[PDB]
């Protein structure tokens, strides 16, 4: 039961997870279709922006370009979600067969194993409306503990945190479409009760 | 005893400063009083420490004691300085300052993407006098959570 | 405690006396000791300049007497002339003990011992070398004012004191 | 005490997770993004990977120095010591080897044994001759070393995925940065 098979650090993955978002902003704002910096390579030059200025460029982003960004985040979460679910297949969980007729039985899979694998802990609560709408909860979403809010400007800080939520949107969308189809699935906020984010699915 | 607390920079600007006895924590009447001359003192005594060094490894300064007060200091390898002032009642605070570096500055400033890493916003006036922002919601709260039980 | 390199600076200029004695080696001494002595002269004024918000008084500023040396030079606890000024420096390889005198003249002992009572034995030892400076340099007629020390006698008066310390 | 002993020692107080099934396919998914968004360009992807690498290396150097408190390096003996004996030890659970320095020792190479960034990828035929895969590592080794006051330049020579020769990275001191002291 206790498998001690090879491993790396959590911190470098968590910070790579965090810099997937300005990677997406950099790949959209620089599509190369015809203040910044400059670097020296051998007979070669690159020109970069830094991350927090690019999140501030998301604060000054166009509205249609903002949703053009957010498709890419759920696309990359979708890819890593379906491939990570495909590796979970090796685990041989006995809950499910295919097409998820009993939808909460694989909600008892994702909270038990997938969120344990990505974020080191279970999803602490799940509430069930029986029309397919299921109410996620976790008190502390793991890759936003390191995001420091500024001094008394939390209305900007909400707007600069919640575009980091499209990656687990991609995770749960990818593990659903590894098991057959696409249905609607959104985010929430759910201000926590004792000293983070909630999710809806069909 | 923690009368004051200051953070310096690779580009030699005071970027954070805290004053004890419920004194201002912001970085603006306390600005440039003791900030440049304290850098001159730490830089000068570090420079004569690095000039008179024997062995393979160069040494760095730990503490400076006056009659009134005592100064504890800590450097990184990247060029960022933790300094603190006490009143001789306790021994060296390098464990405390390295706990600050290992548990507060990296957790809420450096790995915090949302605020910049210590730098000058591409200024040619990065030689000095660049006022900066290491203010956050939670950084000052956990810092005063740690520091205020000792007095 | 244990003292390994002695430095006597001017009250208002570059240093008068320097000995890297009892280190059986060759280190550089030429023209960087004048620069470092001038920077000690500057940063004593800088270290005095900044005031933490104490605003109290000496309620103090007096050691005792450990019988350091070897009839000592003084048999009672005494007083101090640097209330708000630099007193030691502490690094990895050395601790530098400094003691200034009321006329403005300072004395520096670089000590290779590593890491309260050290301040007491340091102030006692540097007051004793102030006594030998007064008794063996200021009495000399050939010694002009604020010039480098040329006395051969002051040398084996202080070498014997340091080798009496350890 | 030794730099082998510290780098192995941090693995008793480091939070860990699985190196397959996460963290390989993160890099694989973002390089799939860069391949599909530039319409299979093979050299601009190296530039954007090196840019994101520079940013993550400049953000990672502080966590490396706060995890083990070490003095500032000065030559390519202490950097070639500290890299291969604790840095890839505590960030990737691996250890590379050092060879092929010059006469003045102003370079070295960085032969890597088990790269955990490319485990069973087998890149296709067109990308095999005009693409470098692990450019996030070259970005890290630029951006980390550029903040301990050394200008540097770190480049791949060959790797296992396209070539018979091993995975190695070439590197030049390219001078030592001068710390700027005065006011002006």
From Swiss-Prot, chain A:
InterPro entries from the UniProt entry: NO_sig/Golgi_transp_ligand-bd (IPR024096), TRAPP_component (IPR007194), TRAPPC6/Trs33 (IPR037992)
Protein name: Trafficking protein particle complex subunit 33
A single GO cellular-component term on record: cis-Golgi network
Keyword terms of this UniProt record: Acetylation, Autophagy, Endoplasmic reticulum, ER-Golgi transport, Golgi apparatus, Transport
PANTHER family linked to this entry: GEO08327P1, TRAFFICKING PROTEIN PARTICLE COMPLEX SUBUNIT 6B
Quaternary structure and partners: Part of the multisubunit TRAPP (transport protein particle) I complex composed of BET3, BET5, TRS20, TRS23, TRS31 and TRS33. Part of the multisubunit TRAPP (transport protein particle) II complex composed of BET3, BET5, TRS20, TRS23, TRS31, TRS33, TRS65, TRS85, TRS120 and TRS130. Part of the multisubunit TRAPP (transport protein particle) III complex composed of BET3, BET5, TRS20, TRS23, TRS31, TRS33 and TRS85.
Principal subcellular localisation of the protein: Golgi
Family per similarity comment: Belongs to the TRAPP small subunits family. BET3 subfamily.
GO process annotations (BP): endoplasmic reticulum to Golgi vesicle-mediated transport; intra-Golgi vesicle-mediated transport; macroautophagy; positive regulation of macroautophagy; protein localization to phagophore assembly site; protein-containing complex assembly; protein-containing complex localization; retrograde transport, endosome to Golgi
Entry's localization field: Golgi apparatus, cis-Golgi network; Endoplasmic reticulum; Preautophagosomal structure
Pfam families referenced in this protein's UniProt entry, alphabetically: TRAPP
UniProtKB/Swiss-Prot annotation, chain B:
Domain of life, source organism: Eukaryota
Major localization listed first in the record, in broad terms: Golgi
GO cellular component: cytosol; endoplasmic reticulum; phagophore assembly site; TRAPP complex; TRAPPI protein complex; TRAPPII protein complex; TRAPPIII protein complex
Gene Ontology biological-process annotations: endoplasmic reticulum to Golgi vesicle-mediated transport; intra-Golgi vesicle-mediated transport; macroautophagy; retrograde transport, endosome to Golgi
Keywords for the protein's UniProt record, in alphabetical order: Autophagy, Endoplasmic reticulum, ER-Golgi transport, Golgi apparatus, Transport
Keyword Transport assigned: yes
Keyword NAD: no
SMART domains: Sybindin (SM01399)
Protein location: Golgi apparatus, cis-Golgi network; Endoplasmic reticulum; Preautophagosomal structure
Similarity remark: Belongs to the TRAPP small subunits family. BET5 subfamily.
Subunit structure: Part of the multisubunit TRAPP (transport protein particle) I complex composed of BET3, BET5, TRS20, TRS23, TRS31 and TRS33. Part of the multisubunit TRAPP (transport protein particle) II complex composed of BET3, BET5, TRS20, TRS23, TRS31, TRS33, TRS65, TRS85, TRS120 and TRS130. Part of the multisubunit TRAPP (transport protein particle) III complex composed of BET3, BET5, TRS20, TRS23, TRS31, TRS33 and TRS85.
Entry protein name: Trafficking protein particle complex subunit BET5
Organism, as annotated: Saccharomyces cerevisiae (strain ATCC 204508 / S288c)
Organismal lineage: Eukaryota, Fungi, Dikarya, Ascomycota, Saccharomycotina
Curated annotation (Swiss-Prot), chain C:
GO (cellular component) term, any one: TRAPPII protein complex
Biological process according to GO: chromosome organization; endoplasmic reticulum to Golgi vesicle-mediated transport; intra-Golgi vesicle-mediated transport; macroautophagy; retrograde transport, endosome to Golgi
Primary subcellular site in the record, as a coarse category: Golgi
Cellular compartments annotated: Golgi apparatus, cis-Golgi network; Endoplasmic reticulum; Preautophagosomal structure
Keywords: Autophagy, Endoplasmic reticulum, ER-Golgi transport, Golgi apparatus, Transport
Record bears the keyword Acetylation: no
Further facts: Present with 3130 molecules/cell in log phase SD medium.
Assembly with partners or alone: Part of the multisubunit TRAPP (transport protein particle) I complex composed of BET3, BET5, TRS20, TRS23, TRS31 and TRS33. Part of the multisubunit TRAPP (transport protein particle) II complex composed of BET3, BET5, TRS20, TRS23, TRS31, TRS33, TRS65, TRS85, TRS120 and TRS130. Part of the multisubunit TRAPP (transport protein particle) III complex composed of BET3, BET5, TRS20, TRS23, TRS31, TRS33 and TRS85.
Name the UniProt record assigns to this protein: Trafficking protein particle complex subunit 23
Taxon lineage: Eukaryota, Fungi, Dikarya, Ascomycota, Saccharomycotina
Swiss-Prot record, chain D:
Lipidation (S-palmitoyl cysteine): 73
Keyword flag RNA-binding: no
InterPro entries according to UniProt: Bet3 (IPR016721), NO_sig/Golgi_transp_ligand-bd (IPR024096), TRAPP_component (IPR007194)
Alphabetic keyword roster: Autophagy, Endoplasmic reticulum, ER-Golgi transport, Golgi apparatus, Lipoprotein, Palmitate, Transport
Subcellular localization(s) per the UniProt record: Golgi apparatus, cis-Golgi network; Endoplasmic reticulum; Preautophagosomal structure
Main localization of the protein described in the UniProt heading: Golgi
Any one biological process term the GO annotation gives: intra-Golgi vesicle-mediated transport
Mutagenesis or variant effect for residue 73 to S: Loss of palmitoylation
Keyword Electron transport: no
GO annotation, cellular component aspect: cis-Golgi network membrane; cytosol; endoplasmic reticulum; phagophore assembly site; TRAPP complex; TRAPPI protein complex; TRAPPII protein complex; TRAPPIII protein complex
Lineage top rank: taxon: Eukaryota
Stored Pfam families: TRAPP
Signal peptide: none
Function: Component of the TRAPP I, TRAPP II and TRAPP III complexes which act as guanine nucleotide exchange factors (GEF) for YPT1. TRAPP I plays a key role in the late stages of endoplasmic reticulum to Golgi traffic. TRAPP II plays a role in intra-Golgi transport. TRAPP III plays a role in autophagosome formation. Required for sporulation. Has a role late in meiosis following DNA replication.
Other facts noted in the record for this chain: Present with 2370 molecules/cell in log phase SD medium.
Family: Belongs to the TRAPP small subunits family. BET3 subfamily.
Protein name: Trafficking protein particle complex subunit BET3
Organism listed in the record: Saccharomyces cerevisiae (strain ATCC 204508 / S288c) (Baker's yeast)
């Amino acid at each position: 039961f206790e498998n001690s098979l090879p491993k790396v650090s959590q911190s470098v993955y968590q910070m790579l997870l965090n810099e997937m978002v300005p990677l997406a902003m950099g790949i959209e704002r620089q599509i190369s279709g015809d203040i910044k910096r400059l670097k020296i390579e051998e007979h070669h030059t690159v020109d970069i922006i830094r991350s927090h200025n690019l999140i501030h460029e998301l604060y000054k982003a166009d509205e249609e370009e903002k949703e053009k960004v957010l498709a890419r985040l759920r696309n990359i979460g979708f890819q890593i979600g379906l491939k990570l679910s495909e590796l979970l297949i090796f685990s041989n969980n006995p809950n499910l067969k295919f097409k998820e007729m009993d939808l909460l039985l694989i909600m008892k899979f994702i909270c038990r194993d997938v969120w344990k694998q990505i974020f080191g802990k279970q999803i602490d609560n799940l509430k069930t409306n029986h029309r397919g709408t299921f109410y996620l909860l976790d008190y502390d979403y793991r890759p936003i503990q390191s995001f420091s809010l500024e001094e008394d400007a939390k209305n900007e800080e909400l707007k600069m945190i919640e575009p980091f939520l499209e990656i687990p949107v991609g995770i749960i969308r990818g593990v659903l479409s590894s098991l057959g189809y696409s249905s609607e699935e959104v985010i929430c906020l759910a201000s926590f009760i004792d000293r983070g984010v909630s999710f809806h699915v069909q | 005893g923690i009368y004051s607390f200051w953070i310096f920079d690779r580009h030699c600007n005071c970027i954070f400063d805290r004053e004890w006895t419920l004194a201002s924590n912001s970085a603006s009447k306390q600005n440039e009083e003791d900030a440049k001359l304290l850098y001159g003192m730490i830089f000068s005594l570090r420079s004569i420490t690095q000039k008179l060094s024997k062995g393979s490894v160069k040494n760095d300064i730990r503490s400076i004691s006056t009659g009134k007060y005592r100064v504890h200091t800590y450097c990184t390898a990247s060029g960022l300085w933790f300094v603190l002032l006490s009143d001789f009642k306790q021994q060296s605070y390098t464990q405390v300052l390295q706990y600050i570096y290992s548990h507060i500055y990296v957790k809420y400033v450096s790995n915090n993407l949302l605020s910049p890493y210590d730098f000058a916003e591409n200024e040619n006036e990065m030689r000095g006098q660049g006022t900066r922002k290491i203010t956050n919601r939670n950084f000052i709260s956990v810092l005063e959570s740690f520091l205020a039980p000792m007095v | 405690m244990a003292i390994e390199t002695i430095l006597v600076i001017n009250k208002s200029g570059g240093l008068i006396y320097q000995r890297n004695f009892t280190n059986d080696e060759q280190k550089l001494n030429s023209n960087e000791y004048l620069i470092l002595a001038s920077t000690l002269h500057g940063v004593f004024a800088i270290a005095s300049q900044l005031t933490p918000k104490a605003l109290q008084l000496t309620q103090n500023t007096i050691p005792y007497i450990p019988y350091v040396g070897m009839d000592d030079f003084f048999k009672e606890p005494f007083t101090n002339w640097n209330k708000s000024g630099l007193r030691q420096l502490c690094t990895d390889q050395f601790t530098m003990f400094i003691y200034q005198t009321l006329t403005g003249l300072k004395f520096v002992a670089i000590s290779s011992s590593v890491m309260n009572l050290a301040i007491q034995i340091a102030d006692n030892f540097l007051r004793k070398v102030y006594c030998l400076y007064s008794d063996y340099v200021m009495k000399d007629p050939s010694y002009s004012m604020e010039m480098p020390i040329r006395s051969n006698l002051f040398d084996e008066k202080v070498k014997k004191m340091v080798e009496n310390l350890q | 005490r030794s730099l082998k002993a510290m780098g192995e020692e941090i693995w008793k107080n480091k939070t860990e997770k699985i190196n397959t099934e996460l963290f390989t396919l993160t890099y694989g998914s973002i390089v799939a993004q860069l391949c599909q968004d530039y319409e299979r360009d093979f050299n601009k992807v190296n530039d954007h990977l090196y840019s994101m690498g520079y940013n993550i290396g400049c953000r990672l150097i502080e966590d490396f120095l706060a995890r083990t408190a070490l003095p500032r390096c000065e030559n390519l003996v202490k950097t070639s010591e500290v890299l291969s004996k604790c840095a890839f030890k505590i960030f990737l659970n691996i250890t590379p080897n050092i060879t092929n320095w010059s006469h003045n020792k102003d370079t070295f190479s960085l032969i890597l044994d088990e790269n955990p960034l490319a485990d069973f990828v087998e890149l296709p035929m067109d990308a095999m001759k005009s693409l470098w895969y692990s450019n996030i590592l070259c970005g890290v080794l630029k951006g980390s070393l550029e903040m301990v006051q050394l200008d540097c330049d770190v480049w791949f020579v060959s790797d296992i995925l396209r070539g018979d020769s091993q995975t190695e990275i070439k590197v030049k001191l390219n001078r030592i940065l001068k710390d700027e002291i005065p006011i002006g």
